[PDB]
Amino acid sequence: TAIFSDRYKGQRVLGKGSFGEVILCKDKITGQECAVKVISKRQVKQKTDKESLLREVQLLKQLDHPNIMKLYEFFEDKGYFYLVGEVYTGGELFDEIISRKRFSEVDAARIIRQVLSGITYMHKNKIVHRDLKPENLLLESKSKDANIRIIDFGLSTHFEASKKMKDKIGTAYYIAPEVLHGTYDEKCDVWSTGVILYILLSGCPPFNGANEYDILKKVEKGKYTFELPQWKKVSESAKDLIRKMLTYVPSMRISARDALDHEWIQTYTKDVPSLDNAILNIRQFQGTQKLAQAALLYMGSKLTSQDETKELTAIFHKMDKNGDGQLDRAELIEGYKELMRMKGLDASAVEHEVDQVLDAVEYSEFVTVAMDRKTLLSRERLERAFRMFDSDNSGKISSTELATIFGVSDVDSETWKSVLSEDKNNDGEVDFDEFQQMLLKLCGN
Numbered sequence: 001t002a003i004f005s006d007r008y009k010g011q012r013v014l015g016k017g018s019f020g021e022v023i024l025c026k027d028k029i030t031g032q033e034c035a036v037k038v039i040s041k042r043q044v045k046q047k048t049d050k051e052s053l054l055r056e057v058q059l060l061k062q063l064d065h066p067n068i069m070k071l072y073e074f075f076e077d078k079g080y081f082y083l084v085g086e087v088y089t090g091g092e093l094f095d096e097i098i099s100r101k102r103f104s105e106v107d108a109a110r111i112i113r114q115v116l117s118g119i120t121y122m123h124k125n126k127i128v129h130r131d132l133k134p135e136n137l138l139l140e141s142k143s144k145d146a147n148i149r150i151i152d153f154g155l156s157t158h159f160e161a162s163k164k165m166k167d168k169i170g171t172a173y174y175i176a177p178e179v180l181h182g183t184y185d186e187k188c189d190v191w192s193t194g195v196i197l198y199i200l201l202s203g204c205p206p207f208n209g210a211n212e213y214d215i216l217k218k219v220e221k222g223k224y225t226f227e228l229p230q231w232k233k234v235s236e237s238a239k240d241l242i243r244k245m246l247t248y249v250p251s252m253r254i255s256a257r258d259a260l261d262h263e264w265i266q267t268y269t270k271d272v273p274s275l276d277n278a279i280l281n282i283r284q285f286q287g288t289q290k291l292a293q294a295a296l297l298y299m300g301s302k303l304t305s306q307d308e309t310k311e312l313t314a315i316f317h318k319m320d321k322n323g324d325g326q327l328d329r330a331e332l333i334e335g336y337k338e339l340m341r342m343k344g345l346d347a348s349a350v351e352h353e354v355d356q357v358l359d360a361v362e363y364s365e366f367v368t369v370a371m372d373r374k375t376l377l378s379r380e381r382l383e384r385a386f387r388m389f390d391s392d393n394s395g396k397i398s399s400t401e402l403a404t405i406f407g408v409s410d411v412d413s414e415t416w417k418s419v420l421s422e423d424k425n426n427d428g429e430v431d432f433d434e435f436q437q438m439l440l441k442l443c444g445n
């Protein structure tokens with residue numbers, strides 16, 4: 001088997017996806033940029049054997065469709081899997097819809113016609129997504145008229161899903177009822193696309209709730225209504241496709257192929273009023289999801305930072321021979337690499353990361369800067385998410401909004417209310433510092 005680091009080099013972290021982090025890597029000869037998903041074998045358990053994974057990857061490489069992500073290579077070592085594929089700079093689909101001023105059924109029809117064309121192609125090759133959601137709908141380029149590329153097709157079949165809430169944010173909305181009970185087939189992707197189509201034309205999920213188990217309760221029952229003012233401006237054929245896509249029994253449910261031939265897809269692609277109420281609801285929804293996610297990733301980063309701060313200090317304590325509390329530049333690289341070796345790109349990137357800390361910055365001061373640089377992304381994303389969530393720029397977030405944020409994050413109502421009081425003002429609203437202080441107290445600080 002070939003080695004990944006010998007062919008590729010890490011450029012920058014693009015983000016966090018399902019089953020692992022996505023790194024922008026570049027080929028050391030041709031210079032081709034690629035987005036590599038790094039799945040840790042310790043944190044992610046396999047549902048299938050090695051021969052089944054190698055056979056699916058081999059097929060996935062030969063598959064090609066303009067609305068499906070392209071996979072180029074695959075590597076494996078003692079504790080990692082490297083899925084190498086194409087880079088898409090357009091970002092998530094919903095992040096683009098919140099920035100534009102006008103959105104209509106013609107935009108939603110062109111969006112879902114692409115998603116269906118991608119799903120139809122992957123169904124013919126006997127590949128299922130299972131966890132289809134807006135987060136997996138990336139745009140190929142920064143231009144407005146850009147193709148939608150679906151990511152993570154077939155990973156759910158070979159890798160076990162996470163039980164951590166930071167990895168399950170917003171999944172309960174789009175999951176099909178048959179997937180929760182065990183027996184399911186490719187029709188679960190039509191339900192998920194049906195839920196996305198519902199949110200594109202209204203901005204509120206069909207199966208909604210104040211917590212994960214309340215959302216799954218509505219999904220399992222399978223009941224939903226078009227009883228909102230925003231559904232009056234929408235056509236009847238759009239609702240007929242939704243009714244067919246959200247049919248409880250999968251055998252009675254429409255296929256991805258037959259959904260393209262529907263009267264709504266054929267009329268709105270081949271009067272069209274703007275859905276203004278849906279844009280504000282998608283904006284309010286997207287912001288709530290991203291702040292709830294950033295809150296959990298901030299709490300997770302503080303726990304791993306405190307865990308790694310004491311670990312790096314214990315490694316440098318043993319390496320200190322005389323006991324002056326100082327170490328050489330070459331020694332700090334051996335200890336910083338030892339911290340990475342114990343906790344699961346290469347030696348050159350590890351040596352560069354130590355030089356980046358030493359340019360700014362005693363080994364106690366080195367750990368303080370090095371560990372703050374690891375959390376720099378999670379601290380800034382939390383503040384940026386709080387600012388975006390606070391659309392009226394009042395600087396505060398009300399108790400009703402906190403209950404919605406903590407509700408999506410699965411933090412119990414009685415737990416965050418006890419933490420809020422440990423701020424005795426009783427204002428019924430909190431600023432960023434007060435919100436940050438609550439998250440710190442909710443993760444043992």
Ligand SMILES: CC(C)(C)n1nc(Cc2c[nH]c3ccccc23)c2c(N)ncnc21
Nearest residue numbers: 014015017022035037083086087088151152
């Ligand atoms: C989560 C973010 C938005 C950072 N992300 N995720 C991906 C998907 C992805 C990147 N590499 C993969 C390998 C197997 C399956 C899925 C993937 C991806 C990509 N291609 N290009 C730019 N960003 C990407």
